[PDB]
Design a protein around this ligand. Structure first.
Ligand SMILES: Nc1ncnc2c1ncn2[C@@H]1O[C@H](COP(=O)(O)OP(=O)(O)NP(=O)(O)O)[C@@H](O)[C@H]1O
Ligand SMILES: Nc1ncnc2c1ncn2[C@@H]1O[C@H](COP(=O)(O)OP(=O)(O)NP(=O)(O)O)[C@@H](O)[C@H]1O
Ligand SMILES: Nc1ncnc2c1ncn2[C@@H]1O[C@H](COP(=O)(O)OP(=O)(O)NP(=O)(O)O)[C@@H](O)[C@H]1O
Ligand SMILES: Nc1ncnc2c1ncn2[C@@H]1O[C@H](COP(=O)(O)OP(=O)(O)O)[C@@H](O)[C@H]1O
Ligand SMILES: Nc1ncnc2c1ncn2[C@@H]1O[C@H](COP(=O)(O)OP(=O)(O)O)[C@@H](O)[C@H]1O
Ligand SMILES: [Mg+2]
Ligand SMILES: [Mg+2]
Ligand SMILES: [Mg+2]
Lengths: 353, 352, 352, 351, 351
């Protein structure tokens, strides 16, 4: 099965995020979100079965044959880490493999503004990095955590399902817990995380009420907490967070957020104007006293207006302001910027200004 | 095989359904009316062997476990079929429906242009609802054929059973049949997020767990397709919200207000010509006002927004659709009035 | 075997039910009233051996597991039977109901011509209601036999248990028994729409889910038959609407106003001769006015429309039927007045 | 083993309802509701244990020793039936035994008015006999069922927990199912009762919503259904029945009750002025069209006013009218009549 | 044989509580303050053997199962005691209270006459509430002693553990201790209705099941006593209703409106004399208006009815009781104002 080795090598070499193997199609690779077939014959059921089975242990093979489903992770030394999923479709084996890179890119390499660098220096509070799946959230978080590891002498604990970016010890002590192996669940890790003397905590996705309450507790007890959401803007993120709670407990949730919130980042990856790379578009909200009052008063919407005027002082930036800058530097096309702008008339006005 | 010849005769005679049951010969529905084939009447041995001849072992044990079975299967070079096997008077019986190999286009199916714009949506939840056999699977197959044609993305479907097949075009299309490819809807949804999908078809919203999985998919940056047996957009939204406990409904309403991108409610009416059947469809496309009504739990008043969203968003109430079908003489006046949820409004449209 | 002779005596004497229990001789219900047979009283050994003699081993173990058992069985050349076996005072007891092989005609049953016109309806909901043993299943079997004779369509029945048998005539007739052919009414209704039916018998309207299934069937182009234990058309309509939550009653009323094609409410009265029984039936056939009253929630006033739909539509109130039965001397004056829902109206009709 | 026989014989002979055996007290017998100690020495733990164990099987003995609780029923031939409960208190055995008589008294012997006799002739519907525990409800129901058994050629089925009064076949076929032995539960008996070709059904206590739905279904499908409640008046009974259902389903419950209700009896037993007998006080509501309308319109309370004026036409009688009659005949004392009257001002006005 | 001497010394010096724990000698609370006995400090062997010396084997295994145990026990010829055994720093510890053989009377306890009229009620639910050690069991024991004295009825109590003992007077009194006589509150309530009771004490309303059982008992013609840790009648009613799911609260409110006969809310205050304690008690006796407020879910406004029901029904808010105790110089001004739930109302009444 030296074909799996060559297929995964091409996946790495061409900068693909995911490799897809299924019957009646050639192997296909996702690059910056878009699928490309490899110049190979289409696979049959024999091909897909032999190829997917070639990277499994006997226990994992029997587990797949017992369930027609299998999640796993594996490494190719000197090449990359991978997340694998094996399943069955149309009576035949299919497989998907996701890249977990060895190298974390820097802030400047990722296109992140200096305000993110100042956020990596925050001593305590809740910082949220949000966006849709595969919008660069884990990569940005890994860059911030790598900066903390480099600059501070503190204890960083991450809880991940699964562990993606690895952070070997630099000046910090870094402990990384994988759900389903190192710890039973997010709930159990968060149940014991406060007794483990942390300073900085990564909690992963805000998957349930319990994890949300844990993040509010972390931000209230003197820690810097990182979490993700799949929301697309700062205002949408705050409303989503508040509205998951029963109406009687939303006052407390709003007060907690008004006290502890230190930053909201909402990312999305857009195709570059060149047609091959992708560029990060990011909305940055850094709370000032006015925004904290709007949070306490339940006037969430008006926060967007504060972001429109917080450019010079705090490095704040609405999504439309970022799309404007990406458009003037010719990094994205006009169609992509307009097609994704949350308010096209504002972007038009900025383009006329 | 005998089954091969029976299904070949079904195809050759332009029949819509083949019926196999004891003490009758095989019968075929032609133009709505049953006709017996010139064959001896079947006994229980005949019906059981014939129906079992097109089942897998897993499907056989499922039928023997439940005395019910829905399934689909193909005869290469001939056609696909949807089968239902059941038990009556202590003996096996079966019904078999034709599923053509060639999928019709949006314009051939009578679907308005807003459905074509829905096939281009990048993320969100799109619901196609209506009673059983109201064209829901056919509309979704047309939409999925459009995504497959136009996008370079990963489409995964979970079906019980797989009906329309979507061979790879520009997309990678994976189709999982419950009871063979995957253990259940729950298991497929348990692993679907780890499979790098972009567009997902989840089938019928059969339980609370599946609804929560679909909300998670639609919230995490994917375009999710699902079906319900509701008859209108408002009825669909109320049905979706009301299945949850009262304390968790606020979040469900917030999720729907955020992720909803379209609601289609279909029904099939006999055409005025006598040969076709025509799709009547209610289309709701959420605007900021509708999303607010959803958050405020003012669901009913959404129908009023649909009454005025014709020019701006391509929206259309069921009565507006029956009216358009009536002015073009596609349906009779009796069918349009007999099916209109508000006959006085349609009357007013005729006075206008 | 003794049981063969007991059931033969039950058939020969025109009894409806045979009762077997300890410390009493076998007893037969004739025209509603019990009669002991000229035999010694049974003991626990007698009742247990007799009831067990007509059970399979699986059924015996089920009875011993639950102290309850429903079943149906046939005696070739004699009759079908519905059996119930239970336990009382620590001993076995059993009841057995006659299911005749021959279905009587409309004219033999005393059913008016409007019922014959109802057997020709292409789609909709037709309800046959009344108390237990009021002739509902027999009327439904006559209607279904008429459809089987006249149409080339697919009839599916769901029964607990199967009572009247309908061998294929011009139709394909499939009959599913709950607890053997299908797990439940809910499961049969879950798959019945995927079985290409034209006419459906669903049995008793036992819960809301079955009601929604019947409304869906009647709205999707099918003719649906069901029973209720209500005693009048108005009482039936109110009962159907009032089982739903207040917020969904508007929809239920609109559905009923669209799909309802007939309501029959039966009761069996002793004949004046003392030997036969005569059917008294209230017939409601919806006209546009009644459909409007249904949509406007003015249900009671429907009785007034039935009072005047005699000449035009063949409609008939229960009191009008008792009046006709009284003038033809089919029933006594005491029975007609004693059963009339409004004795002053019947008096006025008698003075007219 | 020969002490229990004498104690139960004494229980029967003195007309007591229950015998109580517990440590540091002599045996005590409930007569007309009040406990009387027998002229015997007080029992110790050895006495109570041996005496209670004397009427148990080995299976029942080990079941009691496994759980410190035991319910059972048993018969003494030629004497009576009994319901027994054995339990443990203060580390010692205790026991209670309730009488189940072989003989059913007549309507006239029980003090029941003729309207009850006309209720035993009702061909269909729901008839409710209510009152507190031990207020004569099972005895009245047994008398009515014995009347149906005597007069009709129909099928009577009873579901009981446990079976109390026994109805041997007369002109009817009578089947009696005991919960826990003959049938698994009220739910199972009602799951199969409609397939057992009944005409008259006794369902016992209205334990839950499911049993209520079963009784309404039985009443609306052409059967005469008997049930009990522990309410104290017709109005209170109707309100309790309606109020147990969710608000959205109460319209249907009120419509069903308005259609099927044929009678409500609310009983209580009062000490006779003589000091030795007890007398039945009974409230009788028989629905007329006006009352059925009040039921449909949710105007339940005003039904009491109809009962005040339905005396001559239907044999109706409020509780206060019954107490007034009992007081005029000096069957009860003034203190008992006033102390149990639901409206003392009305009774004062009538007097 | 050391425990006997330690409890004897506890009794002789008039101490209220005995405390035994490791690394300290035995300590006795005298006039509220701890005094160590002139004995060597206990080790873990000492404390475990001493505490285990007054436990049954069942109670020992329950303690080893839970590291907690509440119980009561007697020393013949001496006294009863309430014990709590627990674990601290890996070692056994124990606390022991005196339970006197003589039950005080209503007048000796400071209970108003309405409580005496409550001891005569024929049926219903009577609640005596307040925090732990507010006199609830003592008040209940006084009421039960009054019923035992005055009635010829059957009293059954279920207790965890049994506190006051009620020897038979004119009633038959059976007392079941959870964990010895009966498996659980649930099992006792499973069989209590088959034991022919008239008056029942059910202990703490520990869960929803016990609440439903108490409501069934109260509606089936029995007088039911129970406790809660609420501090007022309004708070008690709201606490009882709000435990149930929203859909069942209508039925619970209807049941309470029908069966409730009294709500008693107690607390013990230091006497102005410095040596006695005085009972402060809020008394709610339902009238038709209060029952309507219960049915209509207007619970709060019930307090206003208590404010005006003093002359007619013997009703009394907590503030009115504190006002009376202050006028009689039974309590100090600081104690009354400090414990009053509404100091502004008490100030207006006083001044
Ligand atoms: N600023 C960026 N510029 C270019 N590529 C990026 C950037 N950030 C992330 N990526 C790349 O694009 C892919 C995004 O993957 P990832 O960062 O893990 O998204 P994600 O939000 O964590 N998805 P998920 O955890 O499943 O919800 C990765 O393969 C990165 O290599
Ligand atoms: N019009 C009629 N005239 C005379 N006899 C009839 C008539 N209709 C039915 N019967 C007879 O009277 C009996 C009625 O039984 P059936 O028709 O099954 O009532 P049912 O409503 O179906 N009872 P159930 O299913 O238990 O609710 C049958 O034995 C028939 O033979
Ligand atoms: N009208 C009556 N007059 C005098 N005594 C009566 C009368 N009715 C019943 N009794 C007697 O008083 C006792 C009442 O017992 P019973 O009739 O079983 O009450 P109950 O309502 O059925 N109790 P329960 O089943 O536990 O809720 C019986 O022992 C009867 O003998
Ligand atoms: N717009 C349409 N116009 C005419 N016929 C249609 C249309 N859509 C579907 N059909 C056909 O009517 C039947 C509906 O079947 P189907 O779409 O599978 O219903 P279901 O919603 O239960 O999946 C099929 O035969 C289908 O080919
Ligand atoms: N009215 C009262 N007046 C004075 N002392 C009382 C009064 N009631 C109880 N006590 C005493 O205070 C303590 C209360 O104990 P107890 O009644 O058992 O509290 P609980 O409510 O937790 O069961 C006991 O020592 C008791 O003797
Ligand atoms: Mg990630
Ligand atoms: Mg029938
Ligand atoms: Mg009874």
């Amino acid at each position: 099965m030296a074909n799996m080795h060559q297929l995964l090598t091409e996946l790495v070499n061409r900068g693909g995020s995911d490799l897809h193997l299924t019957t009646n199609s050639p192997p296909q690779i996702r690059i910056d979100g878009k699928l490309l077939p490899l110049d190979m014959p289409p696979l049959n059921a024999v091909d897909t079965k032999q190829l997917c089975y070639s990277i499994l242990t006997e226990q994992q093979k029997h587990k797949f044959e017992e369930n027609n489903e299998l999640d796993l992770s594996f490494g190719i030394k000197g090449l990359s880490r991978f997340r694998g999923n094996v399943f069955v479709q149309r009576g035949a084996v299919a497989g998907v493999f996701r890249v977990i890179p060895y190298k974390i890119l820097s802030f400047e390499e990722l296109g992140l503004p200096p305000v993110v660098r100042e956020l990596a220096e925050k001593p305590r509070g809740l910082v949220l990095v949000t966006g849709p799946t595969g919008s660069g959230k884990s990569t940005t978080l890994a860059a911030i955590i790598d900066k903390i590891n480099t600059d501070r002498h503190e204890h960083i604990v991450t809880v991940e399902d699964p562990i993606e970016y690895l952070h070997p010890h630099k000046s910090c002590v870094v402990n990384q817990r994988e759900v389903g192996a190192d710890t039973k669940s997010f709930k159990n890790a968060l149940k014991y995380i406060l007794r483990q003397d942390p300073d900085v905590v990564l909690v992963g996705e805000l998957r349930d009420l319990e994890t949300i309450e844990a993040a509010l507790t972390l931000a209230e007890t003197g820690h810097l907490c990182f979490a993700t959401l799949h929301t697309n803007s700062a205002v949408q993120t705050i409303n989503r967070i508040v509205d998951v709670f029963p109406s009687y407990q939303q006052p407390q949730v709003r007060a907690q957020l008004s006290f502890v919130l230190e930053g909201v980042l909402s990312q999305t990856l857009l195709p570059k104007a060149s047609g091959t790379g992708r560029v990060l578009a990011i909305e940055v909200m850094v709370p000032n006293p006015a925004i904290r009052n709007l949070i306490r008063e339940d006037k969430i919407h008006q926060i967007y207006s504060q972001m429109q005027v917080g450019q010079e002082k705090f490095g704040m930036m609405t999504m439309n302001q970022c799309l404007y800058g990406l458009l003037q530097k010719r990094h994205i096309t006009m169609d992509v910027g307009m097609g994704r702008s949350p308010d096209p008339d504002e972007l038009k006005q900025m383009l006329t200004s």
